[PDB]
Structure formats: C-alpha cells, structure tokens
Design a protein around this motif. Structure first.
Motif, PDB file in Angstrom:
ATOM      1  N   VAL A  30       0.848  -1.180   0.000  1.00 30.99           N
ATOM      2  CA  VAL A  30       0.000   0.000   0.000  1.00 30.99           C
ATOM      3  C   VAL A  30       0.889   1.236   0.000  1.00 30.99           C
ATOM      4  CG1 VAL A  30      -1.866   1.156   1.183  1.00 30.99           C
ATOM      5  CG2 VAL A  30      -1.738  -1.289   1.231  1.00 30.99           C
ATOM      6  N   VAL A  33     -10.656  -5.660  -3.959  1.00 29.34           N
ATOM      7  CA  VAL A  33      -9.393  -5.425  -3.277  1.00 29.34           C
ATOM      8  C   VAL A  33      -9.562  -5.682  -1.784  1.00 29.34           C
ATOM      9  CG1 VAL A  33      -7.542  -3.795  -2.955  1.00 29.34           C
ATOM     10  CG2 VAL A  33      -8.832  -3.751  -5.029  1.00 29.34           C
ATOM     11  N   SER A  60      -8.267  -6.426   1.978  1.00 28.61           N
ATOM     12  CA  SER A  60      -7.112  -6.082   2.791  1.00 28.61           C
ATOM     13  C   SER A  60      -6.504  -7.311   3.455  1.00 28.61           C
ATOM     14  CB  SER A  60      -7.496  -5.068   3.863  1.00 28.61           C
ATOM     15  OG  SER A  60      -6.389  -4.795   4.699  1.00 28.61           O
ATOM     16  N   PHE A  86      -8.090   1.971   3.554  1.00 33.54           N
ATOM     17  CA  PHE A  86      -7.227   2.215   2.409  1.00 33.54           C
ATOM     18  C   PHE A  86      -8.045   2.783   1.266  1.00 33.54           C
ATOM     19  CE2 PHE A  86      -8.453  -1.391  -0.239  1.00 33.54           C
ATOM     20  CZ  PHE A  86      -9.042  -2.225   0.676  1.00 33.54           C
ATOM     21  N   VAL A  97      -8.263   2.658  -3.318  1.00 30.34           N
ATOM     22  CA  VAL A  97      -7.792   1.949  -4.499  1.00 30.34           C
ATOM     23  C   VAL A  97      -7.794   2.897  -5.682  1.00 30.34           C
ATOM     24  CG1 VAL A  97      -8.218   0.079  -6.087  1.00 30.34           C
ATOM     25  CG2 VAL A  97      -8.522  -0.255  -3.671  1.00 30.34           C
ATOM     26  N   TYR A 151      -3.675   0.336  -7.750  1.00 30.61           N
ATOM     27  CA  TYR A 151      -2.751   0.477  -6.644  1.00 30.61           C
ATOM     28  C   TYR A 151      -3.557   0.822  -5.409  1.00 30.61           C
ATOM     29  CZ  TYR A 151      -3.141   5.351  -8.185  1.00 30.61           C
ATOM     30  OH  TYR A 151      -3.605   6.572  -8.605  1.00 30.61           O
ATOM     31  N   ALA A 152      -2.926   0.691  -4.257  1.00 23.38           N
ATOM     32  CA  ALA A 152      -3.576   0.987  -2.997  1.00 23.38           C
ATOM     33  C   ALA A 152      -2.799   2.073  -2.287  1.00 23.38           C
ATOM     34  CB  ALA A 152      -3.664  -0.244  -2.117  1.00 23.38           C
ATOM     35  N   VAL A 195      -2.018  -5.625   0.742  1.00 26.29           N
ATOM     36  CA  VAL A 195      -3.410  -5.726   0.334  1.00 26.29           C
ATOM     37  C   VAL A 195      -3.477  -6.736  -0.803  1.00 26.29           C
ATOM     38  CG1 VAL A 195      -3.469  -3.860  -1.372  1.00 26.29           C
ATOM     39  CG2 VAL A 195      -5.462  -4.321  -0.004  1.00 26.29           C
TER      40      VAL A 195
END
Lengths: 267, 35, 228, 258, 228, 258, 35, 35
Positions: free
Chosen positions: F48, F127, F129, F136, F138, F218-219, F235
């Motif tokens: 992340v 997504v 975790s 988070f 995304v 992406y996170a 993640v």
C-alpha cells in the motif's frame, strides 16, 4: 379363502393357513422401472430366475429366550449359501454382474401345532449389518451353526458391536457407545412384518420392492433387505409334543435388472 | 413448502435456491398394503 | 437510494426462522429419486404403526398370565406418554420429542397362547381419579370392553381422548390432569380354561399404535440419553 | 374391534369404532418431514485454521504422522471420527490420558426422530463463532473432493492455497456470522441413515458409506501464516435441512431403562 | 424510509456470487470482435478434439509393438482421469480441473506402420474387477472390439460409461468404484505379418477424445504444479 | 468405428455407434466459458502506498534509480515482473540474497483452463485487505495511461496527486472492501493469452504485448505524506472476468511427469 | 448470460454495466470443417 | 385492528403474525340485560 397357491416359474409352493401377501410400500412391488445409472442393456428377468428358492433356517427350542433372532441377508444368503439356500441359475448370474437391482418376495414357513405356543416376528429389515461380526467379516456356516440364534444383548440393542475401521496407534481409542445400525427390538414392527403365531398361521407372506441409495446397487456387497426372524413369545409345549419345530423360508426375486456383465467374481 | 413463511417473493430462482432433479424420460397412505 | 430503517432484531441469528438464505453453490441437478418407494409425507404415518410395549417383569413385551386368580389387574400402566412402558414405542418415542398431543392412543393386543385356549379379558380404561382402581367391580364401572378369545386373536382397544383441554401434555414433569390421563388396566374376567396337555401360563402380547385422529404439536429438544 | 395383528396391517380406528364417540379435529401438522427438520442445531465445535493444514490421513493411522485433527467438519448426521465418516460413535469418559483425542460428532436432534432409512435435503450451514470479536472465514469442498494443502508465497507472506478456489470461501465480518445453503451434492441419490452395503470390494467395512455427506467445511483466520497466533480459537457449526425428504420407515434408538 | 432488515451474511465477500457489481468507468464502447472466427461457446468443444496420450517406455505417445508374442496386454492403463497417461490430454487436463464427469471417454488409434503390414488388434475395456485381466481369454469375455488393419487406419473405440452413479469422480485420491472405472487393454490378436524389407516393430499411436455426450460438473481449484 | 484420424476431423461418437447402447442425458453446462471464468481468484498481493510514489522505470534498469517496486498491480493474467508486462515468469528459489527482489505475478487458475488464444472480458476487481482494521483506497489508471507522480501542497500537508483524478479512486471504509467492475479498455480488440508478434519495430521483444491489460490498480492510505508510518501494509487483489468470450482454441500447460 | 442469477431487475443500464461493441456498418459446432 | 398503523403491507402472513382459532363446526352493548 385361506388356501393360496403361488405358481412362479416351475417351482410352485402352497399354503393352507395364509394370512395374505403383505405388499410393502406400494400396491404392486412387482412393477419396477429399469435403472437410470446404466447405458448398457440390462439383463431382465427370465424363466430360470423367476422362481422360489427354498432354504433352511435354524431350529427353535425352549432354550430360545425373548428376542433371540436370526438374520438372513438378501442377496447375501445366495453368496454364502446360508441354510443351504443355493440359488442355482440366480447365483450363477449374480456372480456375473456388477449391478443388481431386484425386489424380494419372501415367505417363512414354520408349522406349529394347536398345542404349541410361541410367536415369531418375521420381518424384512432394510439396511442392517446383523450378519457381520464386529471385527468386519461376515459369519461363515459354522459360526451360523455354533450358536443357532443371536441373543439380543446390550450390544445389539444399542448399536455398539457394529463393524468399524480401527483408528490406529496415533489416536486414543474411545469408549464406543452407539452406532446407527442398532436394533430397537420393541420397534421391529415398523418394518414389513407378519407375526407367525402358533394359533393363526404356519406361513407369513411378505413382498418388498427395491430400495437403496443408488438406482441400482452393487451385486457382491449389497445388504438392501434382511429377513429377520425374531422370537417374541418363547416356545412352550407339554412333554410328548413335537419338539423343536424347524423353520424354512422361500425367497423369490421379483423383477431383477442386472447390469454390467463381467466374469465370475474372484477376490 | 415446509417451514417457509415467505409467500410473496423469491429473489433467487428455483434452480439456485432449491436443487431440482434432472428428468430421465391431509391424505396419508399406509406403508403396508395387504393383498 | 431507498430509505430503509432496520429493526431492533437486526443481524440476529434466530435458529427457526421460516425463511431461506443465500445460495452459494447453486444450479446443481441432483439425481432423481423417483425409484424409491414409500416416502414419509408426515411422521404420523409411523405413529399409526403398532409397536411393542415394554413391561417390567430383561423387560418383557408380553404379559404372563398366572392361573392363580386374585382380584387385581393383571397388568396396569398410566396413560402418560413419558411412562417407561412407552419409551420404545413409535407412539411414545416420537411424542417424547414433542410437547403436546391430541387424539386416541390405540392399544392392540394379541393372545399368543395355544389355539385350544378359551377365556375372556376385560380391558378397562379409567379416567384420572384419586386412586387407581383395583377391584374388578371398580373397573367395570369405568370404560371397559370384554375381549373374547377365538378364531381371531387381536383386539384394538381405542383409548378415548378425555381431556379438559384441547391438547394434552406429553411429559409429566409435574403430574397433573394435563399430562396424566388415567390408568389402563387388563383384568382376567374368566380364568383361561386350558385343555389337558397344553402349556400353562400363556402370554398376552401388547402393542401401542395411534388413532386415525392422533395429532402432535410443538417440537421440543430431544433427550440424548441414548448415546451415553 | 375384533382384528388380526398377525396379518401386519392394523387399521387405526377412532373412539367411534368401538364405543359411542366421535372424531377429533386435526389441529396441527408439525409432524411434516419438510417442517420438522427445517430448524438449526449444533453439529460440531471445530477449531479454526491458522496455517496451511494437512487433511487427516485415512484409517488406521500410525504414530508420528504430523496431521491436523479436529479442524474439519464433515457435514453428516452420521457418526464421524477425526473428520472422517465412521460407523461406531465413541465418546471419552476418562479423557485426561495420552494419545491424540479424536474429534467425534453426531447429530443428537436428528436420530431421535430419524425413524427412517433414507434422507435427502439441501443443507443450510450457519457458522457461529465462539470467540469474542473474531473475524474468520469458512471454506468448503464438496462430496468427492479433497483439501488443497500447501502455501503459495505472496509478497514474502505464505498465503495458503485454501484462500483461493472455485468452492465458496465465505468471509465473516468482525463479529458477524456465515450462512449459506449448500445443495445436495453427493454422488448417492439419498443419504443412508442406516446402511448395510460396502463401498469398496476388498477390505471394505460393512455399513460405512463413502460419500454420504454434504462435504466438509472448515474455518480459517484470513491472515497469512506469519501472523499465526498461539491461543486456539473455536467456532460452532449450525446446520439446517432445507427441503427434507425421508423414505423407508425404520427404527428409533434404544431408550435405556435405568 | 423503507424499513429493511439486513441478513446475517451482510458485508460478506463471497467469491462466486451469481451477481454483478457497481460499475466505476461505464459507457465504454469496446472495438468489435466480429472478425475473429471460432468462438469457443463451451469448453466441451475442445474435449471432443483427440489429443495424444503419453506412455512410459522420455515418455512416448505411441506404442512399440514387439514381434515376441506373449499372452499379455501390449499396453494397458486404468480409465481414471487422474492417471498419468491422461495428464496432457484435453480430456484429462480439462477434467483434472473439475470434480465430476459423465459420458464416454473416446480412445482413437492410428496404426503408423507401413502400408503392406496386416494384422488384428483387440481393444478390450474391462469394468472394475478385483484383478486386472491379463490373458487374452480374460479380455475376450469383457467388452472388446477386434480392429483390423487395412485401407483405413483408425478406430475410435468409444469406452462406455458403466457407473453405479449418475456422475463419476475425476480424481482418485481414495480409490473406489466412483473414480476408477476399470482398465483399458490392447492385445495383439494375430501377430503383425510384415513382408520382406519392411521395418520391424511398427507403432500404434493413441489418441483420447471425448464422446458426444461427455459432460462435466463442479469446477474445483487447479494444480499450479506446472509453474514450478 | 472404422475412421481416419489423419484427416483431422474425427466425429465424436456414443456407445451406440459401435456397441448396443444408448445416449446419456447432458446434465450440466459448467464448461460454458461465460460461466467458468465468472469467479474470483487471487491475482497479486501488492503493498500500500504511503507517499507520492514513482512508477517503475522501463527495462532494463540500472542501479541507483530510486523507484518503488511491488506497489502496482498490472491487471493481466499474463506473467508480469516489477509491475510491467513480461514474457517469462520467474519465481525466487533462494531469495535471501542482495539486489531488489522483483514482484512477479501470474493467474494460476487461468492458465490451467486457458486452452485458447484470445480472450475478452469485463474485469471485476475486488481489493481485500490483509491488515487488521485498515482504511485504504484503491486507485486505477487505464490501458495507455501513466501514473501522475508528485505532490501538491494543501495546508502545508504534502497531498499527492493520486488522490485527485478522473479515474476511479474508490475509498474503502475502515474494515471494508472495494469492488468495482472495470470495462474492457485496452486498445487491442482482444487480450492475447499467447502472442507472437511485436509491438515495436526496432529493438522489440517477440511475444510481449504492450497494451494487453485492464490497466493498473494500486492501494494508498488516504493520509498525507507527513503521516507516513514505518510498518509496511499489504493488500490482496481479487479479479473476476465478467462476460468472458474466448476465441481460437490452443494448448494447456505441460504437466510434468515427476 | 453466464453466472448471473439476477433474472428480475437490472438497476444500472446495459451500457454502464456491460461494455457493448460499436457497430461498423446446446448446439456446439466443430472447430474444423473437412471440405 | 388495535394499535397498528401499518395500513399498507403485511410481510408475514396472518397465521404467522397473529394466532387464529381453529374452528369447531361505536356500538357498545350493555353487560347486564334486564328481562
């Protein structure tokens, strides 16, 4: 009236004190559909396996207590030849097929006089392992001769002596207390049963269809129905009467649908 | 229908909720017929 | 957005909700079961099958009949479906798993003696009283039915449903008129006349089925005392 | 009335058959098979996976084999032992001894009214936690499958292979529950409550059905193997037999007289 | 406000729910794919394509035929779709990714010897027995089909579906009658009569397609052992 | 029957073709391409973002270049390395050495039944975790875009530019998940599972498709750069191929014989 | 329709949920036709 | 109907919500009738 002659194939049997053919679970258990778990053409019935197969059963004394029973597995009696019950053209066909599917029509004769008392409970019990010793193997002919009658102990009432797979030395072996192939001896009359009383009849007439978890079970291993002769009231007679009346049974496989022809069964 | 009080509306269909059988081709009857 | 207000019982797992749930592995064609006969539509199809009762004398399904004639009931038991003459009947072992019932317990006899035996038996159901009847004249005043021995050898004594309520309890924890419905009692009216060279003390065999109007209600938790 | 119980058919009669009475109105139908079994009950208290486990090796098992016992719930009312179907049911009386104490389970509420032989129903599994504020996850694999037992490395974290799969891995929320109805997936047409045949041909145990089940669920904490804790967490499995159908009437278990 | 009560499986991510989800980048016209031919509507269109089996003698797709005549099967393998003669067939490499099947495995041969060679081959499928048949008289009693060599050079031996269940397992972890469906066995009935100046020991080439009624069910997790 | 397998067309026959049998009823259609690929599976365990990252520089990369590896998830079943599409798939056997251990990913469940060449489907990204109680967010950027890599100062907090954008930045709740279906956005009409052409003309790698992807997620933790922690949070990315269509039958991977 | 058990109601339209192709202007066929 | 303001829609049926009686076969009247 009470005189019914049941001609089947060439072996026709007679009775003059019949109570009626107890057709079980359906009106006509002779009618049956072919299996749906096979794509080859099934060997249907023919006039050498549509007949009555008379065998013997062990005798019945005063020493028989209440609920001492004696089980006849079907078609397990054709394989092991229990009581001399030789199938002939049926055993020689059932060893050459992998899937057998038939209903049974049994008839137990036991001729008590009007001076004897005692009553058998002849019933067709589905799906029990009453013949098999608790080590895992079935009884031989001598083991069905050394005892003559299986006594209803605590192990048969509860279900404790049924066969099992041993856990091994890794696990700790538990105290085995229950198993679902018990006998509840007070509740055997839920099954298709007729009481063979000493004062009403000498022959009971049961007719059962095919039941089983698959539309056709295996041939050399199945125990779908099980003839179960249980002593409810013990035998009693004054001295001088005919001692130890013998018990026979006549089995006719109604509508068999064999499948899967292979050679004779060798282990 | 059993223990089902939802008389009105089934969201998922009958094949997803239940499990039907594929085809091959008040009144309580007795379990033993004397003939 | 549909504005919904969830209730106070939200996210509550209740075990016996009359509702389905989300499928996870749907669209599975199970193999057909048209070949198996005898589908139990309702469990009252089995309570109407007569099963053996059990009597304390190694408990015995039959009743020995002594030739000593004393003015007592030959065998007697209360009509309470938690009594231990009912633990292994399909009437009694199903209804011990429920809470209420309604209808007629049906006691069926079978004289398992010789054919040449004669005699008569009195089958008296008593309603609940302060004391169980013992004299033959105290059971004659109740509801009875004199049963004869002959060519036929059974007698289905339909015990009536006499109750101050629409349903009766089936588990006499605290004994009352809602669980215990009086006693059954079998007297030998005339002594059994056996001819010479016939076995003494024949055996009456008891059954216990349910009536054609036998009804059950309110499933409760069972007793796992069998598995011990 | 004057009847014959030797015949095998005894017609159930009312009070009006022999006496001067009448009928009673049939009140409730709670004896309906589809209604009676449609209610939840405890099946097995199973332990929650924290690592890539090993499915228990088949019987008999010698010592030294590092397996994982009591982590798998074989969804069957029949007697099981060590997450495999068995015939005899055993429970421990003096359990504080050596050896590995095997997990045995049985459906107590089922056999008291399993007065029949065969049974088919869509199972409804509910997996209730026995841990304060636990986030877990329920795996499954059907009747005739096996547990994929290894771990594939994801970003230097040993993620086991029982996260992925085509079988339903239902994730519980933190303090939530899992509930999903499973169809009848066995190769048998019905589930034999009582069975007398043999699945194999040689060295077979009489009365042990091989595939009379709805599969096997398990519980696993959805963290990788490096986040394995020490204290063992339990979880409870509640099952419900939706759309039950029962054939072939049979016996009820022997109530003792002591 | 519509009062809704969410269930016990709320906010649960289940991987195989039969349902869509919220779009985030909607209204995208993808370019059309009307030009590409041969769309795989169903993956059974590829199981019905015959692919080479693999035999342990550097594993070999064909079968060498020695001229030494001994009463044994020339090559034999069980009909179990996890057996290593099936790891690289489209019948076997697709059905190893599933759990059940139904239908007829179809074994196709191709005699890759010279044209002037004659001879006959016996193609015997045996149902599961206690012991694999070895004698020619023990495979004659089973289901066989004597194949001739001539102008045509193939023989599609459709192995029948003989099963005690509607579906069969496809992964014999614990061996039973639900996963292993007996053995296939190729005997040389008459020895191959080669003329002078023709190569000894010709080669029978085996294929394995699926029948026209071959059906599959229950996708399971694959085996990533290829990527290692 | 008497056939010719040299011809290339072998008609599939039943038992009744050569023997005396019949057909079997076609039970299930679980081999349907639109049904088989419509299920979630693990794709990549990505780390992340905690700061304004740098997209990894294209290959080959010399030492000293401060980039950020293993933070980006190139949504493609094909073999990737360092969040860029590759051809050969490599995994580490003795990984405890020097150098930068590149993030490699592959869709294991895809290639076992990728018996075809071309493939087109709307991807459904989930997504999940791998952190207890993580909030988070995304990001995404399509097939043919690049990562905007800087930070604009908001109230003396260096907010990076990957908060804003016209591409979906889906924010997870604390303990929640992210799930949004992505359309087929590539410039290619279909995704070549196997490819033999070359995207460029000079210094091109044969078999490396440039834009056979659904973009790159992406996170990122939705806090500014001053609130950067130290412990790395992971993640997991689950993908599902909605509305799959597969053309041109092809091979399956070589199962080894050891 | 694939693995979609929602026979009843689609909230988002067909262009937003799926991704249609812009225009330019049971039975399983074989993959190889002998001619 | 009592203290029930839900004039529109009953989700559970009348047998599940209430408890009806099984059959056997404005204006306020006084409680004592002089005859």
């Amino acid at each position: 009236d009470r005189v019914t002659t049941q001609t089947a194939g060439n072996t026709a049997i007679n009775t003059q004190s019949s109570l009626g053919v107890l057709c079980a679970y359906v009106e006509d258990p002779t009618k049956s559909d072919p299996p749906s778990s096979s794509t080859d053409q099934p060997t249907t019935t023919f006039t050498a396996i549509d007949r009555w197969y008379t065998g013997r059963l062990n005798s019945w004394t005063k020493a028989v207590k209440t609920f001492s029973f004696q089980a006849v597995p079907l078609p397990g009696a054709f394989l092991s030849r229990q009581g001399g019950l030789n199938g002939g053209a049926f055993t020689a066909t059932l060893h050459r097929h992998f899937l057998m599917k038939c209903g049974w029509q049994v008839q137990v004769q036991c001729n008590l006089t009007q001076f004897h008392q005692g009553a058998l409970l002849v019933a067709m019990v589905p799906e029990t392992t009453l013949d098999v010793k608790p080590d895992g193997k079935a009884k031989s002919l001598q083991e069905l001769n050394e005892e003559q009658w299986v006594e209803m102990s605590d192990d048969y009432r509860t279900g404790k002596n049924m066969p099992f797979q041993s856990l091994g030395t890794y696990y700790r072996p538990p105290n085995w207390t229950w198993g679902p192939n018990f006998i509840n001896p007070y509740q055997v009359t839920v099954f298709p049963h007729q009481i063979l009383n000493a004062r009403t009849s000498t022959s009971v007439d049961i007719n059962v269809p095919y039941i089983g978890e698959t539309p056709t079970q295996s041939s050399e291993t199945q125990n779908s129905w099980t003839l179960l002769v249980m002593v409810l009231v013990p035998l009693d007679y004054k001295e001088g009467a005919t001692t130890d009346p013998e018990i026979t049974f006549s089995v006719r496989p109604t509508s068999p649908y064999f499948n899967g022809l292979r050679n004779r069964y060798t282990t | 229908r059993g223990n089902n009080g939802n008389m009105t509306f089934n969201y998922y269909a009958n094949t997803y909720q239940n499990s039907v059988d594929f085809s091959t081709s008040g009144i309580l009857n007795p379990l033993g017929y004397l003939k | 957005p549909i504005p919904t207000a969830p209730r106070e019982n939200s996210l509550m797992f209740l075990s016996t909700t009359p509702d389905d749930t989300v499928p996870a592995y749907g669209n599975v064609r199970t193999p057909p079961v048209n070949y198996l006969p005898g589908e139990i539509t309702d469990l009252l199809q089995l309570a109407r099958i007569p099963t053996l009762m059990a009597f304390g004398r190694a408990y015995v399904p039959y009743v020995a009949v002594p030739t000593q004639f004393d003015d007592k009931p030959l065998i007697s038991f209360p009509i309470t479906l938690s009594d231990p003459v009912y633990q292994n009947t399909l009437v009694g072992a199903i209804s011990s798993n429920f809470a209420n019932y309604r209808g007629c317990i049906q006691i069926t006899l079978t004289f398992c003696g010789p054919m040449m035996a004669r005699g008569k038996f009195l089958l008296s159901y008593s309603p609940p009283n302060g004391t169980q009847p013992q004299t033959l004249s105290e059971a004659m005043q109740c509801t009875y039915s004199i049963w004869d021995i002959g060519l036929n050898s059974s007698w289905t004594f339909v015990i009536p449903y006499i109750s101050p309520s629409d349903y009766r309890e089936t588990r006499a924890i605290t004994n009352s008129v809602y669980s215990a419905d009086g006693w059954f009692s079998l007297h030998k009216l005339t002594k059994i006349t056996l001819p010479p060279d016939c076995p003494q003390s024949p055996c009456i065999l008891f059954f216990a089925s349910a009536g054609e109007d036998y009804t059950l209600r309110l499933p409760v938790d069972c007793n796992p005392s069998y598995v011990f | 009335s004057t009847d014959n119980a030797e015949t095998g058919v005894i017609e159930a009669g009312n009070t009006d058959t022999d006496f001067s009475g009448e009928l009673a109105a049939p009140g409730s139908n709670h004896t309906n098979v589809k209604f009676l079994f449609d209610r939840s009950r405890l099946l097995n208290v199973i332990k929650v996976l924290e690592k890539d486990a090993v499915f228990p090796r088949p019987f008999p098992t010698a010592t030294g084999t590092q397996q994982d016992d009591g982590y798998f719930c074989l969804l069957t009312p029949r007697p099981t032992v060590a997450s495999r179907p068995a015939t005899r049911f055993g429970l421990y009386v003096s359990p504080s001894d050596s050896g590995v104490l095997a997990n045995t389970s049985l459906d107590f509420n089922f056999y008291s009214l399993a007065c029949f032989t065969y049974f088919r129903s869509d199972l409804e599994v509910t997996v209730v936690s026995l841990e304060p504020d636990l986030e877990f996850a329920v795996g499954w694999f059907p009747s005739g499958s096996e547990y994929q037992a290894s771990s594939f490395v994801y970003d230097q974290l040993h993620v086991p292979y029982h996260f992925t799969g085509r079988t339903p891995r239902a994730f519980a929320s933190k303090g939530g529950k899992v509930s999903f109805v499973l169809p009848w997936n066995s190769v048998s047409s019905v589930l034999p409550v009582r069975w007398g045949g043999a699945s194999k041909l040689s060295s077979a145990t009489r009365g042990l059905p091989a595939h009379a089940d709805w599969g096997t669920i398990y519980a696993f904490i959805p963290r990788p193997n490096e986040k394995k804790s020490t204290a063992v967490k339990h979880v409870a499995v509640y099952i419900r037999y939706k759309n039950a159908r029962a054939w072939c009437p049979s016996m009820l278990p022997f109530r003792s007289y002591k």
